Design a binder for this molecule. Structure first.
Ligand SMILES: [Br-]
Ligand SMILES: [Br-]
Ligand SMILES: [Br-]
Ligand SMILES: [Br-]
Length: 131
């Protein structure tokens, strides 16, 4: 239903990330000194309009925001696609994959940047991802 909510279809458990939404959003550490700004289920006020995540140093987009929350194998996931053109001979764009995993007891982390696909992979351990 693409409103920052999703159910586990096997159990009907309703997951909801609306409590993390807001333009102020969050940041994740990037490299030595940089960061990435990110808003959940909406654009981030530090990024260009419509952009849900962007590099701190440049405000260059690594994904357009959306509310299409998905459930797969106990993980909740947002995928912000259509980022800026990345350094790529074949014309790829940056995208951000944001994975919420259960923590029964709340900052995103960048765990990987796959240069092959220009995809930034983030993880966020949160009680919001538990059932
Ligand atoms: Br940066
Ligand atoms: Br949105
Ligand atoms: Br894309
Ligand atoms: Br992790």
């Amino acid at each position: 239903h693409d409103d920052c909510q999703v159910t586990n279809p096997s159990t009907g458990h309703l997951f909801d990330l609306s409590s993390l939404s807001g333009r102020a959003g969050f940041t994740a550490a990037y490299s030595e000194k940089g960061l990435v700004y990110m808003s959940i289920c909406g654009e981030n006020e530090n990024c260009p309009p419509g952009v849900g995540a962007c590099f701190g140093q440049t405000r260059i987009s690594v994904g357009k925001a959306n509310k299409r929350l998905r459930y797969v194998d106990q993980v909740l996931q947002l995928v912000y696609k259509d980022g800026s053109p990345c350094p790529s001979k074949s014309g790829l764009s940056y995208k951000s994959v944001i994975s919420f995993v259960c923590r029964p007891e709340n900052r995103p982390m960048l765990i990987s940047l796959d240069k092959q696909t220009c995809t930034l992979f983030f993880s966020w351990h949160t009680p919001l991802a538990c059932e």
